[PDB]
Amino acid sequence: MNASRALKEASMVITESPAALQLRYLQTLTTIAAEKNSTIVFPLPIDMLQGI
Amino acid sequence: MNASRALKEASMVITESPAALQLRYLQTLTTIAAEKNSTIVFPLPIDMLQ
Amino acid sequence: PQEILTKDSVTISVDGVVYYRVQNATLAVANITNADSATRLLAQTTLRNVLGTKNLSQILSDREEIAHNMQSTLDDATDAWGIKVERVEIKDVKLPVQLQRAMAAEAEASREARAKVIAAEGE
Amino acid sequence: RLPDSGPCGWILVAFSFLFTVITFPISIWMCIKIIKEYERAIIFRLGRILQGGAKGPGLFFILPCTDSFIKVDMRTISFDIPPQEILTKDSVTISVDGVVYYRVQNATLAVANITNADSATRLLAQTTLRNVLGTKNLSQILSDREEIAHNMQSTLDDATDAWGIKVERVEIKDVKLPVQLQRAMAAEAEASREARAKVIAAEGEMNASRALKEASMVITESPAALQLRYLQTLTTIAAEKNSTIVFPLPIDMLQGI
Amino acid sequence: RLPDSGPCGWILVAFSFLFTVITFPISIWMCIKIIKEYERAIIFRLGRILQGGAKGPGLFFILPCTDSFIKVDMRTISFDIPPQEILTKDSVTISVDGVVYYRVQNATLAVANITNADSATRLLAQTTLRNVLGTKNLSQILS
Ligand code: NA
Ligand code: NA
């Protein structure tokens, strides 16, 4: 409950240029990769899959 | 039962803007990654513009 | 040290101390074979029993009540030996390693709640 | 305040007077006792305690046959308590490393009412510290020294009074969490630095964006250029010391089924 | 201020004088004391401290049979504290390695009011450092 207001404020800015959320997504991946754990990553060419 | 009221208040604020809940998801993932023996499988949808 | 079970069935090991004195030298010699050994074993069993009637949270909060309970048991037993037990106290308490992080959940959660507010401000 | 715990005497005393005088140049050294300003003496003669309080500083005479003599230091003493295992009110496992300061307040009780004043006092300090910290949350333990000290003092005074002891301080020199809890409990500090890092990272995205747009506008004029960039990325990744799995995928063969 | 802690005198002192004079070529080296500017002495005569404050620099005479002599260095001392494990206000585990500087400012109290002044001081420094850093966030500790 205490954290919710700031997340709403952040969301209202981010949605005005929605690709910003993908930038946040990619920075999350960089943070996770640094931890001492196994990470498996799948680059996925969706327009190639859209063809079949 | 005791926790439900606060979750409702948090939910009502979060759902007023669409990206907010997604930010909560990504922060959870960052919290998970610090625990031992936590494998994360991560898709990267990419467009080659054909 | 002793191995103990609480009322809520938590396994804990405790490390006690006892204080006592002779108050009737005639009974201490002629009514019991070894007054010191008898007293020290009685202290252990009395501590074992009382803590089994308490939840772990009560053990941390109810020193005065626990002391009052033990004294009645000790006085009834030690009168015939010419002994007065003055205190039984606990020096250490330990959880098994497998239980330690699980039981600490409230403290972990409180710091995690403050972290979330900081992180949301970052976003 | 006394502790809670004849004709033939003159014969023994006289025998002792005679014997010491008969042995004077040797035995007078045993008879003579000197007590310093900061010391006190408890003296028994034929088992009875000499009347009044503990004997003060100065020169004193005793007979080693009939008399027994105990000398008490009245100065403050400090002891380094062995480390302890403790549970907080919020059930956190911590180990603490204490120190206690204490002083003899009444020399008669310290001698004649307790078998070993030091060990009794040192054990009592440990159990009192164990109890008080069990009534506090971990955050309170770090913030509430004055309240914690006040709580302990009243407990200690009620017990040590009968022993003639005054405890002056109990303090902690180390506190440790077990290794499994250390990163979890540090969440608030870790989050603050990550929050500042995120702002720095977003400024980096903004600064780099213009050049990526310029690169994109050239690349899109012959879109197969992006596939060339894709293949050079794969070559870079394969050179790292990590596992790579590659799937050649004949899409026109899949298009047939 | 003082610490919170006759015929037989004359006779015993007189005996000591005679003994030391009879042993004069041996006694010279034990009965005479010299105190530097940066030192003070605490002297007990038959268990009673000599009147006034601690004895200053100079030449002094001690009857070893009746008298006890303690000299105190008044200069600054530095000590390398062993490392400690600490928790910050934000609950970060850190280990710190400290140093303390101190000096005696009243030689009478240092001798007669505490059993071991140095050990008491060094332990007190450790606990004081432990407490204060527990009231500070890690960023405040650095700044
Ligand atoms: Na200690
Ligand atoms: Na040091």
Swiss-Prot record, chain B:
<feature type="region of interest" description="Required for lipid raft association">
    <location>
        <begin position="40"/>
        <end position="42"/>
    </location>
</feature>
<comment type="similarity">
    <text>Belongs to the band 7/mec-2 family.</text>
</comment>
<feature type="modified residue" description="Phosphoserine">
    <location>
        <position position="17"/>
    </location>
</feature>
<protein>
    <recommendedName>
        <fullName>Stomatin</fullName>
    </recommendedName>
</protein>
<feature type="region of interest" description="Required for homooligomerization">
    <location>
        <begin position="38"/>
        <end position="46"/>
    </location>
</feature>
<comment type="function">
    <text>Regulates ion channel activity and transmembrane ion transport. Regulates ASIC2 and ASIC3 channel activity.</text>
</comment>
<comment type="subunit">
    <text>Homodimer and higher order homooligomer. The homodimer is banana-shaped. Interacts with ASIC1, ASIC2 and ASIC3. Interacts with LANCL1. Interacts with SLC2A1. Interacts with SLC4A1; this interaction positively regulates SLC4A1 activity. Identified in large complexes with SLC40A1, SLC14A1, SLC29A1 and AQP1. Interacts with STOML1; may redistribute STOM from the plasma membrane to late endosomes.</text>
</comment>
